[PDB]
Amino acid sequence: HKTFVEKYEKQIKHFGMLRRWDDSQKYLSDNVHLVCEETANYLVIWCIDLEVEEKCALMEQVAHQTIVMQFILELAKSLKVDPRACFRQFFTKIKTADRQYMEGFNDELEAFKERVRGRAKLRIEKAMKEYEEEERKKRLGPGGLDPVEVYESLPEELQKCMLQDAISKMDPTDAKYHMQRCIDSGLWVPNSK
Amino acid sequence: ASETFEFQAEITQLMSLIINTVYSNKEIFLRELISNASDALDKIRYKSLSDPKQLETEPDLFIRITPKPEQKVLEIRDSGIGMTKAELINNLGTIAKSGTKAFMEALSAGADVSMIGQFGVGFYSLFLVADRVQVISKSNDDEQYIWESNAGGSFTVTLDEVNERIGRGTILRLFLKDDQLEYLEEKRIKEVIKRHSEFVAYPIQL
Numbered sequence: 001h002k003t004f005v006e007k008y009e010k011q012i013k014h015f016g017m018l019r020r021w022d023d024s025q026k027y028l029s030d031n032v033h034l035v036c037e038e039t040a041n042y043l044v045i046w047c048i049d050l051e052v053e054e055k056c057a058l059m060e061q062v063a064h065q066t067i068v069m070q071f072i073l074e075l076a077k078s079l080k081v082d083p084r085a086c087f088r089q090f091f092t093k094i095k096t097a098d099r100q101y102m103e104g105f106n107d108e109l110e111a112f113k114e115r116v117r118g119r120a121k122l123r124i125e126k127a128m129k130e131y132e133e134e135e136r137k138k139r140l141g142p143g144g145l146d147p148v149e150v151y152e153s154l155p156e157e158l159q160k161c162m163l164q165d166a167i168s169k170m171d172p173t174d175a176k177y178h179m180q181r182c183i184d185s186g187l188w189v190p191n192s193k
Numbered sequence: 194a195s196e197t198f199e200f201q202a203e204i205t206q207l208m209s210l211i212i213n214t215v216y217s218n219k220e221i222f223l224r225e226l227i228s229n230a231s232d233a234l235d236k237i238r239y240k241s242l243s244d245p246k247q248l249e250t251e252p253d254l255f256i257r258i259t260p261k262p263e264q265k266v267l268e269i270r271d272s273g274i275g276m277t278k279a280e281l282i283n284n285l286g287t288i289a290k291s292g293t294k295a296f297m298e299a300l301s302a303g304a305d306v307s308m309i310g311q312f313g314v315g316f317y318s319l320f321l322v323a324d325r326v327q328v329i330s331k332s333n334d335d336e337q338y339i340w341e342s343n344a345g346g347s348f349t350v351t352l353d354e355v356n357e358r359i360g361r362g363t364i365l366r367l368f369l370k371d372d373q374l375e376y377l378e379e380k381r382i383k384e385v386i387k388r389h390s391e392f393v394a395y396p397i398q399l
Binding site: 018020050060061 | 291295298299302303304308310312313392
């Protein structure tokens with residue numbers, strides 16, 4: 001898993017970038033160790049990285065070769081055989097496949113690309129959420145309270161806006177409670193602490 | 194009355210890289226153009242399964258390479274489906290956009306020039322050996338037109354009233370660069386075709 005990738009990265013990527021059936025066959029033939037679950041898995045991860053980097057056009061080219069590899073591993077499990085010894089007959093079947101076969105090949109490619117986009121979108125939203133965590137940190141008041149939250153937690157009245165607010169000293173110690181949170185969130189600066 | 198249009202930006206960018214690259218295995222252009230000629234021929238062959246009279250404008254299915262040493266020109270002809278004026282504009286000037294973009298992306302991610310035919314844009318590889326192309330084409334559905342490019346941002350399209358008439362299909366007329374004159378020699382051409390296009394299913398006439 002780990003260092004299969006480290007050895008063969010360029011070759012997996014190269015296979016990911018091919019497209020013509022004869023070339024894909026030939027390349028796997030010269031490097032039959034590429035024909036395995038680990039290359040499928042790395043191609044899947046590389047598609048998500050490309051789509052997050054906004055290399056959308058290349059992700060589609062790589063996704064096609066991913067589905068090809070997945071289809072090789074599937075047909076191998078069907079036949080009971082080793083994928084390295086039966087991959088050539090995927091290519092043999094694909095070059096003259098019925099129209100209906102190529103239609104389902106295409107639907108599974110498109111569905112795959114959708115799952116890849118859903119995964120990239122998770123990584124992007126993770127980064128947006130981190131960004132907004134820091135926007136949040138940056139507007140915390142001196143006592144660590146967000147004046148957006150505190151504003152909304154206040155009884156209705158309070159000032160989209162001074163000595164008027166002051167005359168509103170009518171309520172028990174609940175007043176200490178919201179006032180303290182206004183000081184801690186920077187909503188109110190005690191002019192003389 | 195020739196008309197001028199700009200290429201999508203990604204196509205102009207790709208032509209720029211290709212015409213300037215010092216990539217030394219330039220002969221792969223001929224492979225790409227022969228593979229396009231073979232696809233254009235499959236197209237007309239497919240269409241004529243339901244419609245045999247489509248073949249009648251040129252019943253012979255072939256690819257033909259003719260050097261013209263006195264013009265420093267190499268022509269690659271096919272009797273495939275051809276392109277209408279609107280197909281010349283669209284196919285060469287516009288919808289290649291996503292293929293040329295994916296290929297430029299591949300080139301920053303570890304691919305090299307000889308992988309261009311994996312992205313559906315091998316046509317543009319002709320700029321490895323030419324500074325200019327005329328694409329002369331005759332589709333059954335239109336007149337004969339000339340599309341012309343010099344790898345810059347614009348191309349022209351002109352009703353053809355100068356060249357030999359084509360029953361159907363397309364000629365790529367390449368205006369070879371000064372350092373790429375070897376592709377005029379029959380011997381050099383035979384070695385390149387034997388090397389890369391042995392498996393092509395149409396006769397290649399030279």
